[PDB]
Paper text:
Ribonucleases H are the only known enzymes that degrade the RNA strand of RNA/DNA hybrids in a sequence-nonspecific manner, and therefore are essential for DNA integrity. Type 1 enzymes hydrolyze all types of RNA/DNA hybrids but require at least four ribonucleotides embedded in a dsDNA sequence to cleave (Ohtani et al., 1999), while most type 2 enzymes can hydrolyze all types of hybrids including DNA-RNA1-DNA/DNA (Eder and Walder, 1991; Eder et al., 1993; Jeong et al., 2004; Ohtani et al., 1999, 2008). Tm-RNase H2 contains two domains—the N-terminal catalytic core adopts the RNase H fold. The nucleic acid substrate is bound in a groove on the surface of the protein which is formed between the catalytic and the C-terminal domains.
For the initial crystallization trials, we employed an inactive Tm-RNase H2 D107N protein. Tm-RNase H2 ΔC D107N underwent extensive crystallization experiments in the presence of RNA/DNA hybrids of various lengths and 12 bp dsDNA harboring a single ribonucleotide in one of the strands (DNA5-RNA1-DNA6/DNA12). Protein-nucleic acid complex crystals were obtained only for the latter substrate, and they grew in the presence of 0.3 M MgCl2. The complex structure was solved by molecular replacement method with the apo structure solved at JCSG as a search model and subsequent manual modeling of the nucleic acid. We call this structure 1R-Mg, and it was refined to 2.0 Å resolution. Ions A and C were also observed in structures of mutant Tm-RNase H2 D107N solved with Mg2+ (structure 1R-Mg), Mn2+ (structure 1R-Mn), and Ca2+ (data not shown), but metal ion B was missing in all these structures. Therefore, the lack of binding of ion B does not depend on its identity and is likely caused by D107N mutation. The 5′-phosphate of the ribonucleotide of the (5′)RNA-DNA(3′) junction is located at the active site of the enzyme in agreement with the cleavage preference. The aromatic ring of the tyrosine stacks with the deoxyribose ring of the deoxyribonucleotide at the +2 position (numbering relative to the scissile phosphate) and seems to push it up, leading to deformation of the nucleic acid backbone at the (5′)RNA-DNA(3′) junction located between positions +1 and +2. The nonbridging oxygen-metal ion distance is 3.3 Å for Mn2+ ion versus 2.4 Å for Mg2+.
Author numbering: 2 to 223
Write the structure that this text describes.
DNA sequence: GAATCAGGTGTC
């Protein structure tokens, strides 16, 4: 209903949502979705089991136009998680072949390159947002599972990079990676000067990133 | 699903 009201006043409306904000590693992912057919059981990604998201997605990729955007750990560290989130969302809109005239964005305080309105608890007031939320979450979880294959010593396929007990265990035993968000507190506290310079020297992080984290490290514990 | 315990950073 909410969507339809907006659909009638503005025309083609996309719903936008993001996954991965609170993570310690990996990109933030956003999805933009325009959907005209119905998909029963569309609802905030959190109130669904992984398996339900799985099949709810299959249907989405068949009945809807979808654009996916990501912002990297480097961009998070340089721009901050909020600006990086808006970047990913704008990238999602760009990758949507159906160019919307209005956007329904999950949350608060976000102005994208397309006029729109933000909705607190948006992923459950709106089907479009609810569907984007599923797309982002599953797509991101795939990304993290595939980080598991790249860094066997990290159960990214389970904790999806969040600050779980085992993830921190893993960081302490194995070391911070370049895919960790080096500006995030628990990562920063385990990082050392030595390791940072090592990242840079091996070409694992850009000079700009190196410089910003070096200064944060300097300001640390103060 | 709901609870309740954990743990991240933006806005203003
Ligand atoms: Mg979400
Ligand atoms: Mg919510």
């Amino acid at each position: 209903g909410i969507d339809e009201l907006y659909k009638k006043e503005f025309g083609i409306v996309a719903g936008v949502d993001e996954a991965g904000r609170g993570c310690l590693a990996g990109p933030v992912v956003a999805a933009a979705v325009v959907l005209e057919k119905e998909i029963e059981g569309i609802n905030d990604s959190k109130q669904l089991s992984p398996a339900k998201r799985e099949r709810l997605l299959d249907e989405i990729m068949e009945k809807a136009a979808v654009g996916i955007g990501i912002a990297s750990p480097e961009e998070i560290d340089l721009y901050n998680i909020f600006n990086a989130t808006k970047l990913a969302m704008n990238r999602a809109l760009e990758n949507l072949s159906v160019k919307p005239s209005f956007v329904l964005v999950n949350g608060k305080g976000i102005e994208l390159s397309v006029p729109g309105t933000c909705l607190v608890k948006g992923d459950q007031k709106s089907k479009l947002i609810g569907a984007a939320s599923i797309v982002a979450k599953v797509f991101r979880d795939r990304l993290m599972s595939e980080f598991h294959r790249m860094y066997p010593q990290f159960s990214f396929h389970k904790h999806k990079g969040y600050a779980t007990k085992e993830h921190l265990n893993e960081i302490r035993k194995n070391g911070v990676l370049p895919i960790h968000r080096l500006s995030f507190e628990p990562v920063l506290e385990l990082l050392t000067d030595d390791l940072l310079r090592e990242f840079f020297e091996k070409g694992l992080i850009s000079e700009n990133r190196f410089e910003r984290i070096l200064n944060l490290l300097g300001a640390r514990k103060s």
